[PDB]
Each structure stands twice: as structure tokens, then as C-alpha cells.
Amino acid sequence: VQLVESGGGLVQPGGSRKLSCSASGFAFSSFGMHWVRQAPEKGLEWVAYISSGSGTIYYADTVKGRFTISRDDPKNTLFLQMTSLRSEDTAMYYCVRSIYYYGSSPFDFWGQGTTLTVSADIVMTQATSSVPVTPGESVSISCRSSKSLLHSNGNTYLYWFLQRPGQSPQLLIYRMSNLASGVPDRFSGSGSGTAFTLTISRLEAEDVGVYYCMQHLEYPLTFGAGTKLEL
Amino acid sequence: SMITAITIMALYSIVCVVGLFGNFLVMYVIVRYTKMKTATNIYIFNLALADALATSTLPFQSVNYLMGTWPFGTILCKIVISIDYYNMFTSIFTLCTMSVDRYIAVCHPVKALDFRTPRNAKIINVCNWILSSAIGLPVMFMATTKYRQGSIDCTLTFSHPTWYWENLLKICVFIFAFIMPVLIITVCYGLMILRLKSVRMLSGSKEKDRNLRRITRMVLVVVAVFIVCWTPIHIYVIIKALVTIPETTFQTVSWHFCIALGYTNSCLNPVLYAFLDENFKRCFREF
Amino acid sequence: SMITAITIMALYSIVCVVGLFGNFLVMYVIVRYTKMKTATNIYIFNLALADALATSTLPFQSVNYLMGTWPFGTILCKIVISIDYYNMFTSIFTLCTMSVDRYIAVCHPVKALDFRTPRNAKIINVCNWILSSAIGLPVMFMATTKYRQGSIDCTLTFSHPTWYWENLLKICVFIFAFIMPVLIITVCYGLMILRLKSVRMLSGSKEKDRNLRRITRMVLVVVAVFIVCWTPIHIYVIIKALVTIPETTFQTVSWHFCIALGYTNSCLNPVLYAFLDENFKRCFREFC
Amino acid sequence: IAQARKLVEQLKMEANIDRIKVSKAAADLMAYCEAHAKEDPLLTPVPASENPFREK
Amino acid sequence: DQLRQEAEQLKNQIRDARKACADATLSQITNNIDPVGRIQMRTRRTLRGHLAKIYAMHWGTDSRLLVSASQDGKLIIWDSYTTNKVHAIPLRSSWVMTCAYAPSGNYVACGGLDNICSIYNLKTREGNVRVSRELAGHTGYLSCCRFLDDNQIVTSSGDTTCALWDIETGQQTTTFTGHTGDVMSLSLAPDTRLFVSGACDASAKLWDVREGMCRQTFTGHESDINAICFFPNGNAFATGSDDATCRLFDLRADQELMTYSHDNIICGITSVSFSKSGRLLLAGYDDFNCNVWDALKADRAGVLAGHDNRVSCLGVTDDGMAVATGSWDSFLKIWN
Amino acid sequence: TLSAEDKAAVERSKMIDRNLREDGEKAAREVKLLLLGAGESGKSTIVKQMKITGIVETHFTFKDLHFKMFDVGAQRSERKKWIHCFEGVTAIIFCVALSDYDLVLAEDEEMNRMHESMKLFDSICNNKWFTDTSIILFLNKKDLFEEKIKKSPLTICYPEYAGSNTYEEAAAYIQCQFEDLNKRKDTKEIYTHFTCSTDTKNVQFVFDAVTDVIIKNNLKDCGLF
Amino acid sequence: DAVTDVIIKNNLKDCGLF
Ligand SMILES: CC(C)CCC[C@@H](C)[C@H]1CC[C@H]2[C@@H]3CC=C4C[C@@H](O)CC[C@]4(C)[C@H]3CC[C@]12C
Ligand SMILES: CC(C)CCC[C@@H](C)[C@H]1CC[C@H]2[C@@H]3CC=C4C[C@@H](O)CC[C@]4(C)[C@H]3CC[C@]12C
Ligand SMILES: CC(C)CCC[C@@H](C)[C@H]1CC[C@H]2[C@@H]3CC=C4C[C@@H](O)CC[C@]4(C)[C@H]3CC[C@]12C
Ligand SMILES: CC(C)CCC[C@@H](C)[C@H]1CC[C@H]2[C@@H]3CC=C4C[C@@H](O)CC[C@]4(C)[C@H]3CC[C@]12C
Ligand SMILES: CC(C)CCC[C@@H](C)[C@H]1CC[C@H]2[C@@H]3CC=C4C[C@@H](O)CC[C@]4(C)[C@H]3CC[C@]12C
Ligand SMILES: CC(C)CCC[C@@H](C)[C@H]1CC[C@H]2[C@@H]3CC=C4C[C@@H](O)CC[C@]4(C)[C@H]3CC[C@]12C
Ligand SMILES: CC(C)CCC[C@@H](C)[C@H]1CC[C@H]2[C@@H]3CC=C4C[C@@H](O)CC[C@]4(C)[C@H]3CC[C@]12C
Ligand SMILES: CC(C)CCC[C@@H](C)[C@H]1CC[C@H]2[C@@H]3CC=C4C[C@@H](O)CC[C@]4(C)[C@H]3CC[C@]12C
Ligand SMILES: CC(C)CCC[C@@H](C)[C@H]1CC[C@H]2[C@@H]3CC=C4C[C@@H](O)CC[C@]4(C)[C@H]3CC[C@]12C
Ligand SMILES: CC(C)CCC[C@@H](C)[C@H]1CC[C@H]2[C@@H]3CC=C4C[C@@H](O)CC[C@]4(C)[C@H]3CC[C@]12C
Ligand SMILES: CCC(=O)N(c1ccccc1)C1CCN(CCc2ccccc2)CC1
Ligand SMILES: CCC(=O)N(c1ccccc1)C1CCN(CCc2ccccc2)CC1
Questions:
Q1: Which residues, renumbered to this chain, carry the PTM ADP-ribosylcysteine (chain F)?
Q2: Could you tell me which residues are beta bridge partners of residue A123?
């Protein structure tokens, strides 16, 4: 499983650019694909989604119309079509594969990121911004929502991400009741509707990064601000 | 005078009651038991539906002759005339499709696997109702009510010239409902009989030979019932148009009898097809 | 191979030139001089227009043979295939209508006063195109571009099952564009010839009989040309469908030649109907 | 002979087994069913809201 | 000569010893408990899309996922609450007679006339359910398989042999022999230390996984044995056979407790199961009906009709909320 | 009502439903054939003619008709339990060798293979699961049978045959005895073809026998037959 | 019927066959 993006570089405003992401070592036709953008000195932000088989397509409201997303299954390549770019699109674009069934772990694998620099609604609330911590103590991170994420089926759609400095982000905890495959048992999620809590027992140097809380109740997907830890 | 009116009315009533009873009974057996799970059952249900709708306008035609005028109103007049023509084409075209269906099943068995499927039977049947609508829609617009001799007449109205468009419709009813379908039914069932004789399964022992006789008998009755019903009504209309014949009591009985003979096939379609089918026969015996 | 390709290219080219020259010239004589003041001349304009659009489809077939592939594109492929299927029916239906037109003019004179008017002739001609549209519109949707052996093929694709729907189209084209038109043209003209002989004006003199024979000669030539051109292509398609034939060098020439005969009648329709027409003949004499 | 001898060897093992009284064993079976009778969904119908399967 | 005669004497000795222990009939002791009464179970979900003859289903331990085995070459894993299909596993060999779902939910087994048991991984990173391990070495058609653990599985085969298989190693560790007839089914006790398998020699033999040798043997049936399921306590196991009878055997008692039969039904029993409490004995007959009987009362508590063909298999979920039956009409129906 | 992941889960189920219906249509066109007979009959030879542990599945396509041949000869298990799996089969290909009558059974007990083959054919033909399924009978080793019948008479194995020693007479008598084993003649056809060293003839006969089964099935579907 | 003959001649002239 590997995802690499191509098509970066500097783009003039008002121009056009077509990105291509190549997939290797997994069944590309069975995964839905997410585009996530990241500002240089701000948190992550969701761009677009295409389902498997191109059955449904969703966009964020700020990026509606200008961005066109397509996919080609016999060549296993994800295509993003960009028209009439503006000065707010100076971001790094990530490719994410998300399978959807009972017990699945979507947002598990993240791309590497292509840089693009241009030169001229459920609101997720990170209450804190930075907490200085020491290796060994228990660390508490709080996230809050504008809408109760407890759905009538019993699932609470909150996903926890960790973006280690200079590396691609990884999924830590999905649905808050399940730990992601490949994550140690140091992380645990708890809380209820509109008030969530994250705990890191037996802190490690690798754990240090930026923590994101994401809602997945309805489109468009809106992310958190991002709580960064330090030593 | 009184006897002649009663006799014509009695003939329509005998056909309509048996015709509605036969058609809806096949609809009841299919829906509550068979539930349209096979391709052949879909065609037989469409015969039951098309013949019942044609038989539904039959008391409305009975009232028109007895009263001498049509009091049902303009809107119903358009709907009733249209249903009579539309179902007639639909019932006959369904027979043509089943003639093609039974031809492909016997003569071309490898390609019958593609053809005899529940999906394909649904597609071709929808095409039958659409191709009948090619004449069903213009009959709606043309049908009007005309005040003649103080009496409302429920009849088709043709744009000028009246003589050209009226007789053009009669020829198309003659060709596409009588000339065309008899060619399809006779050739497809005729080649079928020759192909069944070649089969080594039907030949051989006396018991299997007797069953081949039963199958050959069933095919010939099917072709004959379609011919004997629809031949006098088509020829008599053409004769009437070409040569005017003076109205008399004898014509008054013969004209309605030929029309009643036309609906006899629709009445006899469930008995000839659905009732004598082996699959349906088992269902009646069990329940 | 190379000699065969030149022969096929030359055969289509000769048919295309004569047909375009004949069809447009008839549409030029009608507009610039006749001004469509007559019911019969309205039918001749629709006959010339339908044959012109069918002849316009002929250089596309010429390029398709030599190249072996279709470079024009999907959108043009839909339109080009459709026009060939459409204007074939329109031209043939015009022949049937004019056969009914000439039948009513002789045999039913009182009814011909109502029938043969400029008002009615415009109505019946519009109805021909509408009936033609029944076979004109679905050809537009079905026509696509399929890659065969690395070469694009501009053809028709049917819904599954393919064998049932594709052959049904050929049988419908067979019955409705050949079997029924031949019967309508032959019976109406055949009855007309019998009635013309009975007419007192045509007969009764040796000089008068010469003109009567010429009218009979003209009718038979028109019927013969229609049968001679259309019959080979229709029978050959049915034979090809039922029995697969090896792709011999002679076989390839025969298939295109039968298609050349099919458009030859369209090329020869202005000559028989319009150039040999007495009214048009007077016009040529009038302006010299 | 050897196969028959092997069969008898296994047969001897089965015979020498500690067997408890059937009546005592029967009582234990009845008690287990009664104990967990309330818990069982099939025996006593659960409320619709609690039930995972509902009419759609 | 002497040795063969000794076997008859030993069997007679076992017979006499069994009758010596028995003092009171189970039906006389169960008379005190009141009858359960009419039990009506309504269909909740109807699962479609198999389009072929279903032979086997198995419930998951989360009480929501279940696998199903069909003759079109498909294993379909079902979301029972939302009716959605979770997985569709294409099979190499179409002829499949059993399917197992792991207790953890990681793996799915299948087997049939191809003599190969295929283990399918469900939590792979690639996202397509691929073949993890193929068990081989069976001379007879596999009839049943059950996951004791994520690495150990016991399969029953038509060469009169059973075996304990190490999934990771790929070879068989413990091999069981001694079945005169062909084995048809097996069931796992909750402690998972022992299992009982019924064969076509009218016998059901308890097998101890650790010991590797036959602990007990029961021969109360007339002809053959098609099905066998343990009780929740783990001391009793109802058996279903082709002689239209169902019998209950107690391991500690080592004798036939009770016989479940009625005069009108002459058809065989494809599958048997138990509820959470164990009070209700469910068995799918060949009369197109599933009969819910009561173990203690030995009377019919309900009749489940609605299948158009023979009910191949029947399984009760772990918590006991629902019952899903599989029949040859390609419809899975959930009964609550 | 449904959440975002639940609506995506329904979309996943609809994609699976499209694949299962597509695979179901493909399997319906395919013709399934059951192969039966003894091990020494020549099953491996006749499969190699038609092409050119457990279940051996043979795929060949003749005249745009897909054939699946299932060889069950490898299994040693009791046939009665697993015979119901093959209920939905078009035809049964039953292969035996004509030269089997001189060769006695491998087991010590004296029994003529031909009579073991009669018991083999009688159980399949009178089986309750196979009532309307036709049997395609193949008689193998006719060339060896022609030589053997010249050297050894057919009277020695059973005295009932009293006909003159002729290749045509001896072959036809074996053919009609197999047909007499059928107890339901009206609803079950038996297709007998002598096998030979010519590959072309064998493949054809199967296509002719299967075509009559497809005609029989379609006629039953229509209700005519 | 003399007028009818004239009408037939007029129609043929209109058609252009005559
Ligand atoms: C007023 C009425 C007569 C106008 C025509 C109604 C048409 C649209 C109706 C009448 C008969 C109907 C068909 C009757 C039976 C079936 C079989 C069913 O499994 C699929 C739908 C299908 C194929 C129906 C499609 C719609 C249908 C063709
Ligand atoms: C192969 C089969 C389905 C073809 C059937 C074609 C039939 C349904 C179509 C083709 C020509 C059509 C006719 C064309 C012109 C007219 C004149 C109009 O004022 C009344 C309707 C009428 C008379 C149409 C009735 C329907 C019609 C006869
Ligand atoms: C236009 C094509 C498709 C169909 C042409 C049909 C022609 C042949 C038919 C339709 C209308 C018919 C005419 C309608 C009415 C009459 C009056 C009758 O007392 C004499 C025959 C006569 C004069 C018919 C002659 C034949 C006729 C002209
Ligand atoms: C006379 C016109 C108006 C209608 C003719 C329709 C019928 C009679 C024609 C049209 C299509 C023809 C079929 C075309 C193809 C075949 C396949 C051939 O292997 C057997 C004959 C057969 C089946 C033909 C029989 C006759 C046929 C069915
Ligand atoms: C061969 C069988 C099946 C059908 C025969 C249909 C034709 C030939 C029959 C049936 C109805 C008959 C018509 C009945 C009534 C009349 C009116 C009478 O004043 C003249 C004869 C005439 C016009 C008959 C002519 C022949 C006729 C049209
Ligand atoms: C793309 C084209 C071929 C589609 C068909 C166009 C149709 C609608 C056009 C083409 C030929 C046209 C006819 C040509 C000649 C005349 C005679 C004139 O005095 C009145 C209009 C009339 C009767 C036209 C009516 C409209 C017409 C029938
Ligand atoms: C009297 C004359 C005008 C009648 C002419 C009717 C013709 C034009 C109509 C009637 C039946 C129609 C066909 C009915 C069904 C189909 C199948 C479709 O997938 C392709 C078009 C096709 C093949 C139609 C083509 C046009 C068609 C042949
Ligand atoms: C439905 C009515 C109106 C028209 C029916 C037309 C029938 C007779 C035509 C149309 C499609 C034709 C089939 C199409 C294709 C083939 C394959 C060919 O190798 C043998 C003939 C065969 C099998 C044809 C038999 C005749 C056929 C079934
Ligand atoms: C065979 C089918 C498909 C098409 C037949 C069309 C032609 C040949 C038919 C249909 C209408 C018929 C016409 C109907 C009416 C008359 C009036 C009569 O006084 C002279 C013959 C005449 C003119 C007929 C001649 C033949 C005719 C024109
Ligand atoms: C009578 C005149 C006007 C028209 C004759 C048309 C028919 C009979 C002719 C014209 C084209 C001819 C075909 C031309 C080419 C071939 C290919 C060859 O490998 C077999 C014969 C065959 C198939 C011919 C058969 C007869 C044929 C179809
Ligand atoms: C030549 C065949 C034919 O066209 N018909 C036919 C139709 C079906 C079965 C038998 C014959 C006629 C269609 C028109 N109907 C009368 C319609 C009507 C309804 C209400 C008031 C007035 C008139 C008379 C029969
Ligand atoms: C049986 C009569 C017939 O149907 N035809 C016909 C039509 C007119 C005159 C003579 C014969 C055929 C119609 C289809 N054309 C090809 C159409 C095409 C065009 C451009 C690219 C690709 C294909 C071949 C001739």
C-alpha cells in the first residue's frame, strides 16, 4: 500500500493544474478517495470525495464548482482537475483511501503530499492550542463539537489523527471506541456527546505532534484547529 | 324488432361476462401464486391484462347500440375508443412475440438462453405497449362527439379530406393487425412443427409419439382460433368501405356478430393459452 | 488489392458527382423559375432534397474504405449514419406518395380536386418526414465508434441480445422500404395504365397513340429503374446475414457495387421525374 | 485380527468411565434453563426499542 | 475368534452398565415444569442475491455479522441490521458444503467437494479478501469446520477422519480415526476443550482436543446422523438424524436421555441449534418448515414456515436475539 | 435518517448486487455435465479428446455453448450423501468400456465388471434425485472389444446371450440391455454413442444430446410439453 | 362524362406525364 502525488510546483493565479495520484499494492477500485489540504501555518482542511465506482461526489461549500474530481480504475490513477485557482489555495494536497462497511477503518492510510504555491456546518472547536508536557505523565486533550455526533445507530463519528512533524499524518482512533490497526494501546478515547477527551498514557517522543479531531456525521467535513504538544 | 335488439345485446353480455371472468382469473392465479418469476408467465399476464381492458369497453359499446346515442360525455368517449384500438394491437402483438418466443426456444436453443430470461421478456413487452401507443395516441385526439339526428355519436373525426385519412386507417388496421401477424404466427409455428418432428425425443415409443400429437394439436388450434375470429371482421370492413351495402336487419345482426367474434379470441385467449399450459395446470390441481 | 481500392473509390466518386450535380440543379430550377406554385413541383423538391442529403453521405463512405478507419469522430459518425438511414426512407416514401398522387389524378378525378392542391401537398410531405423520423431518431443514439483491430469502426450497436435486435432492423428495412413500396408503386401505376387506355382523349388516332405509348413507356421505365437499383442490395444483405460468405476480393467489389446501385436510383430520380417532366422541359425551352 | 484387537482396546477405555446418576444430572439441566430464562430474548419478547431489528 | 467374541461381551457389559445407572425417566422428571406454550416468531429481514442453493451459514460473536455459503461460488458476509452486504468472496471451487466464521472475526473458512479448506483473511491492508491458507490432505469431502481459535480449526471430512489443523503451520497436528461411517457435522463446546462429531455409522463420538483420543461414544440412532449441536452448559448435545427423530445425549450420564419425534413427519433433520438459555430446540426439517421444539417438555412450541425448499441450515446467534435460517430457495430469512 | 457512513455502506451493497446479478447470468448460460463411470473406463482419454484430488472441472466451448464437466471419480466416500448436490444438472455422461467383460473385478470375489457396471448404472438411473435428467452413455474400447469377441465368446460370462458371434450383434445387445435398465422411459432419454479414435465425432454427439435437453427444458417452460 | 375526360387531361398536364 503506497500513495504518491505528482503535479506540484508554482501555479499562476487564474490558471489550471491537473494532479495525478498513483496507487500501488491494493485494490484501487474498492476504496473511496479523499483530498485533504493543509495550510503552512494552519490546520488541515477537507477538499473533496469520490465514491468507489463514481456513484456519488461531494465537495466542501468553499470549493464547490472550481474543483473537479474524477478517477480511472483500469489505470489506478486519481485525477483532480483545478480551474480558476485563487490565493487561498496555497496548500499541500493529500490523498486518502477510505473503505466504508461495518467494522471498517476509513482514513487509515494517508498520501505523501504535493506542494502547490500560488502568488498574487458542524464547527469543531479545539479549546486549547498548546500544552507543554513531559515524557511519562498522562496527557489530556479535549475536543468539542457544535452538534451532537451521537447518531441513532449508536456510532459516534469522531476520528483522531496524529501528524508527526515532517511526516504524513496517521489515524490513531476511529469512532472513539476502536483503536486503529498499527496503533499501540497507549492511546484511549473517552467522553460523550459535545464533550470529548483523549488520553495518552506512557508518553513517548514519537507521540509528539499535532492532534486533530474530525467529525464525519455529514458533508462537508470540517476539521479541528489542531492541538500541538511539545517537550 | 324487439327480438333483434335483445339478441344483439345478449351476444355482447355473454362474451363480456365470460371474458372478464376468464381474464381476471388468470391475473389472480399469477399474482397470488406465480408472482411473475419466469419469462413465459410475464407474457401470459400481459395477455390477461390487454384482453380485460378491451373487454371493459364492451358494455360501453352495448349501451351505445341499445340507446341509439352516446350519453357518456366527450372525455369518456375519447378514452373508450382509444382503449379499444390500443388493446387490440397489444393483444395481437403479444401473440406475435410469444410466437417468436416459442420459435426461438425450439429451433435456436443456444441463443434461446439469452432470449428466454425474465429481464428480456420485460424489455420486449414494454416495447409492445409503446408500439401500440403509436396508434393509441392519435385515436385520442381524433375521437370527438358529433350531433347527428339529435343524437350524440361517439366516433372518430378526421381532418379534411375525410375520405383519405379514414380509409388509410382501415388499411393500417387491415395490414398491421391481420396481414402482418398471420404471416408471423403461421411461419414461426409452422417451422416449429417441422423442427419438433426431427427431435428424437418426441419420436420413438407410442407414448412419446402421442405426446407429440398433443403438442401438434395444440399448435394448430392456436393458429385456427386467431384466424377464425379475426378473418371475418377484417374482410367485412374492407367490403363495406369499397362497396356500399343497403342497411337491413340481416346486416344489423351480421355486423355486430363479426365485432363480437373479434372479442371472442380475447375471451378464449386465457382458456386456449393459460389454462392448457402444463405449468399452470399443476397449480390448479394443487390448489 | 491496390487495383481493387482504386475501382471502389472511382465507383463511389462517379455516383457522388452525378448525384450532387443532378439534385442541386433541380433545386435551382424550381427556386429560380418555378417558385413552387404547383402541388406536383412541391413533391419534386422534396424528392431532390432527400436524394441530395443521401448523396452527401457518400464521400464519407469513400474515405472509410480507403483508410480502413473512421477519423471524423463520434458526433459526426452519429449524424452521417443517421442521414443514410433517414433520407433513404424519405426518398422512397416520396416515390410512394407521388405514385398515389398520379393514381388519384387519373382514376378519381372528382376527388383529385380536393387532394391535389398546394395546401394538401405541403401537409402530406411533412407527414413523410415524421414517419421517416421513426427510423431516423434511434439510429442517432445507437451509432457509436468501436475500436476493431486498432481501427475505429463507425457502425451501430444494439442492446443485448444483439442478434435479435440487429436482424429485426434489417427485416423492418426490408419489408417497409422495399416489399411494401414495390407493391404500392406497381399496383397504383399498373391500375393507372389500364385506365389511361380506356380514356377517349389518349386513344382514337394514330398520332394520339404515340403520345399514349410514351406515357406508358415513361411509367414502366420508372418502375423498372426502381426495381433494378434497389433489389440487389436488399437481397445481398439478407443473404449475408443468413449465410456467412468468405471475404473474397470479388466479394468486396460486389458489396460496394450493390451500394452504388442503391444510390444510383437517387442520382437517376431527378432525370426520370424532373428532367423528363413536360413542365420542366418547357422551362428549358423557354429560356435559351 | 490386529484391527479387531485395536477396536477392543478402544472399547475397553470407554467402559471404564465414572458415570453419575441420571436423576442428579437431569436436575442440573432444568436449573440452568430456569436461571437464565429471563435473560433469553426468544422465550420472552423484548420491547421494540430495545430490539435491534425493527420494522422499516 | 476369541477376541471378536469378547467385543460383543464387552458391548453387552456396557449396555448392562448403562441400564444399571438409569433409574428415572427424564420425561417423568420434566413433567413438573410447566409447558412454554405457543411461540410465534415473525420474519424481520429477508436477504437476497445468492441466486443459488445455500448450504451453510454461521453467526458471528458480535451478533450482527454472518457468513453464508452458496453454490454460485460466493461467500457473502451480511450486515443483518441494515440488510447491506459487507463482503463477497469469490470461490475457486463452486461445490461448497460448509462455512465457518472466526470468533475474533478475522477469518472465514469454507470447504466442500474439492477436499480443500480455504481460510480467508478479512482485516488485510489491501482491502480485498484474499486466500490466506489452503488446507490439504483430506481424502474425503469436507462437511463441517469450526474455528476453535484464530490459529486452530477442526474440520470433518468424508474419509471417516477428523483432524486438528494449525492454520499458521499449514499441517495437521492431531488426527482422529475410528469412525466407521462418513462424518457429517461437528459442534464446539463453549469451553472449547472437547467436541462431538456425528457420523453415518449411527454414532456420535466425543473427542478431546488435548487427549487426542475418543472419550465417549453413543449409538442411539436408527440409520445415520446429519446434525449435532452442543447445549450452552456443555454437558449435553442434541443430535439430528435422517430417521425423523432427534435425541439428547448427556456426557456425564453416558446414556440416551430423551427422544424427540412425531408420527406425521418422516423426513430428515438437516440442522439443529440451541437458544441462549437452551430451553428451545430448533431443527430444520425437509418438510419446508422449521420446528421450534422444547427440550424439557418434548413438545412442539412453534412452526416456522416461509421457505420454498428444504432448509439446509439453521443458526441461533450468541446473545440469542435472532434466528437466521438458510434454505435451498436462495433466501436467508431472520426469525425473531 | 441514515448517517454518512451508513449511506456509503448501502452504496457498497448495491455494487455487490450488480456483480452477483452479472455473475448469475453468466452461470445460467453455462451447461453443467456430470461425469460417471469406473476408473478403468477411460475417463481421462475422452476428456483429452474433448479438450483438443476431489473434483476435476473441465472447461470447453463448442458452438458458442459453455460446458462444465465434473469428474467425481477421485472420491472414495459414500456416494449417497453428496449425490443431492448435483440435482440441477443438464445431463449425466456415463462412460464404460466394452472390453470389461473378460477382465474380472480387482477384488478377490468373482464378479464380472459388466455386471458391476450394470449395478453402477442402475443406481444412478433409478436415483430419486435424477428423474428427468437424461444420461449420455459412452461405450469405450470398441476396437479392443471387436478383437476380444472374435477370440472369446460372450456366452461364457452369462448363458442368457445365445446370439451368433458378430461384432454388430454383440455390441447392439450390450446397448439394449443398458436401455432396459431404465425404469422410467418416457421422462428420461438415454443417448448411446460408441467411442472411437476419432476426436471429432465424440465432441459433436455431446452437443446434439445437450441441445435436446435445452429443447425439453424450454418446452416445459412454455407449458406445451 | 366529357368534362371528366378534360379533367383527366388537365391533371396529366399538371402532373406532367402528358
Ligand atoms: C393505461 C395503461 C394500459 C397504459 C400502459 C401501462 C403500462 C405502462 C404498464 C401496464 C402493464 C405493465 C407491465 C405489467 C407487468 C410487468 C411485469 C413486472 O414484473 C414488471 C413491470 C411490468 C413489465 C409492467 C410494466 C408497466 C406496464 C407495461
Ligand atoms: C411494426 C409495427 C409496430 C408498425 C406499426 C406502425 C403504426 C402503429 C403507425 C405507423 C403509421 C401511423 C399512422 C400515420 C398517420 C396517421 C394519420 C393520422 O391522422 C391518424 C393516425 C395515423 C393513421 C397513424 C396511426 C399509427 C400508424 C399506423
Ligand atoms: C401514403 C401511403 C403510405 C399509403 C397510400 C394508401 C393509398 C393507396 C390508399 C389510402 C386512401 C385510399 C383512397 C381512399 C378512398 C377512396 C374512395 C373509394 O371509393 C375509392 C378508393 C379510394 C380512392 C382509395 C384509393 C386508395 C387510397 C388512396
Ligand atoms: C411478407 C412480409 C411482409 C413479412 C414476412 C415475415 C416472415 C414471413 C419472414 C421475415 C423474416 C424471415 C425469417 C428470416 C430468417 C430465417 C432463418 C432461417 O434459417 C429460417 C427461415 C427464417 C426464420 C425466415 C422465415 C421467414 C421470415 C420469418
Ligand atoms: C373463411 C372464414 C374463416 C371467414 C370468411 C369471411 C368472409 C369471406 C365472409 C364473412 C362475412 C361475410 C359477409 C356477411 C354479410 C354480407 C352482407 C350480404 O348482403 C352480402 C354478403 C356479405 C358481404 C358476406 C360476404 C362474405 C363474408 C365477408
Ligand atoms: C434536416 C432536415 C432534412 C429535417 C427535415 C426538414 C423538414 C422539416 C423540411 C425539409 C423539406 C421542407 C419542405 C420543402 C418544401 C416545401 C414546399 C413549400 O412551398 C412549403 C414548405 C415545404 C413543404 C417544406 C416544409 C418543411 C420541410 C419538409
Ligand atoms: C407504413 C410505414 C411508414 C411504416 C414504417 C414503420 C417503421 C418506420 C417503424 C415501425 C417499427 C419501428 C421499429 C420498432 C423497433 C425498433 C427497435 C429499436 O431498438 C430500433 C428501431 C426499431 C427497429 C424501429 C425502427 C422504425 C420502425 C421500423
Ligand atoms: C416481433 C415481430 C414483429 C418480428 C419478429 C421477427 C423475427 C421473425 C425475426 C427477427 C429476429 C430474427 C432472428 C435474428 C437472428 C437469428 C440468427 C440467425 O443465425 C438465425 C435466424 C435468427 C434466429 C432470426 C430468426 C428470425 C427472427 C427471430
Ligand atoms: C401487401 C400490403 C403490405 C400492402 C398493400 C398496399 C396496396 C397494394 C393495396 C392497399 C390499398 C389497396 C387499394 C384499396 C382500394 C382500392 C380501390 C379499388 O377500386 C381499386 C383497388 C384499390 C386501389 C386497392 C389496390 C391495392 C391497394 C393499393
Ligand atoms: C435480378 C437482378 C436485378 C438482381 C440480382 C441480385 C442477386 C440475385 C445477385 C446480385 C449480387 C449477387 C451476389 C454477388 C456476390 C456473391 C458472393 C459470392 O461468393 C457468392 C455469390 C454472391 C452471394 C452473389 C449471389 C447472387 C447475387 C446476390
Ligand atoms: C376491424 C377490427 C376493428 O377495427 N374493430 C374490432 C376491435 C376489437 C375487436 C374486434 C373488432 C372495431 C373497432 C371499433 N369498435 C367500436 C368502437 C366504439 C366504441 C364506443 C362507441 C362507438 C364505437 C368496433 C369494432
Ligand atoms: C439494405 C439497404 C441499406 O440499408 N443501405 C443502403 C442505403 C442507401 C442506399 C443504398 C443502400 C445501407 C445503409 C447503411 N450504409 C452505411 C452507413 C454508414 C455511413 C457512414 C459510415 C458508416 C456507415 C450502407 C448501406
A1: 222
A2: none
Q: Are F186 and F168 in contact (CB under 8 A)?
A: no
Taking CB atoms within 8 Å and a gap of at least 24, the contacts of B191-197 are: B191/B103, B191/B107, B192/B102, B192/B103, B192/B106, B192/B107, B192/B219, B193/B219, B195/B106, B195/B107, B196/B106
Neighbours of chain A (3+ CB pairs under 8 A): E, F
Chain A residue with CA closest to E126: the answer is A26
Residue F180 lies in a domain: yes
Would you say residue F5 lies in a domain?
no
Nearest to B114 among C114, C120, C161 (CB): C161
Distance CA F33, CA F93 (A): 7
Q: Which of C55, C65, C58 is nearest to C7 (CA)?
A: C65
In angstroms, the CA A228 to CA A141 distance is 10
Deposited experimental method: cryo-EM
Residue C272 CA to residue C219 CA, distance in Å, equals: 10
B103, B189 in Cβ contact below 8 A? yes
Going by beta carbons, is chain C in contact with chain B, meaning 3 or more pairs sit under 8 Å apart? yes
Contacts 24+ apart (CB under 8 A), F154-161: F154/F101, F157/F101, F157/F102, F157/F112, F157/F114, F158/F112
Residue F14 in any domain: the answer is no
**HEC sequence for E102-153:** CCCCCEEEEEECCCCEEEEECCCCCCCCCEEEEECCCCCCCCEEEECCCCEE
The rounded distance, in Å, linking the Cα atoms of F151 and F147 is: 7
Based on the structure, what is the number of domains in chain F?
1
Residues of C in contact with G18 (CB under 8 A): 211, 215, 278
Task: Give the closest of F3, F8, F15 to A217, CB-based.
Answer: F3
Asked if A78 and A84 touch (Cβ cutoff 8 Å), the reply is: no
Name beta bridge partners: A231.
Answer: none
Sketch out chain A's domains with CATH numbers: 2-118 (2.60.40.10), 124-229 (2.60.40.10)
Domains annotated for chain E, with CATH where assigned, are 1-335 (2.130.10.10)
Return the residue matching grid coordinates 389472480.
B28
Instruction: Tell me if D22 and E24 make a contact (CB, 8 A cut-off).
Output: yes
In contact, B22 and B266? CB cutoff 8 Å: no
Ligand 3 pocket residue status of C76, Cβ below 6 Å:
no
Is F42 among the domain residues?
A: yes
Domain span including residue B248: 1-287
Work out how many domains chain D is built from and give that number.
Answer: 1
Q: Do A223 and A212 contact (CB within 8 A), yes or no?
A: yes
**Mutational test site, ligand 8, from C160, C167, C169, C172, max ligand atoms within 8 Å of CB:** C167
* Cis, bond preceding E90 (omega within 30 deg of 0): no
Cα–chain center distance at C181:
11
Please tell me the total count of domains within chain C.
1
* CA atoms of B135 and F98, how far apart (whole Å): 67
Tell me the CA–centroid distance for residue B126 and ligand 1, in Å: 7
Nearest partner of F144 among F112, F106, F97, judged by Cα:
F97
C-beta atoms of E65 and A1 within 8 A = no
Residue F82 domain boundaries: 26-219
- Identify the residues whose C-beta falls under 6 Å from ligand 8: B 96-97, 100, 108, 184; C 163-164, 167-168, 171
Here the CATH number for the domain that contains residue F67 is 3.40.50.300
Kindly tell me the burial class for residue E180, based on how many C-beta atoms sit within 10 Å of its own C-beta (0-12, 13-18, 19 or more). Answer: exposed
Q: How many residues does chain E have?
A: 336
> Resolution (in Å) of the shown entry?
3.3
Q: How far is the C-alpha of E140 from the C-alpha of B208, rounded, in Å?
A: 42
Q: What is the largest CA-CA distance in chain D?
A: 67
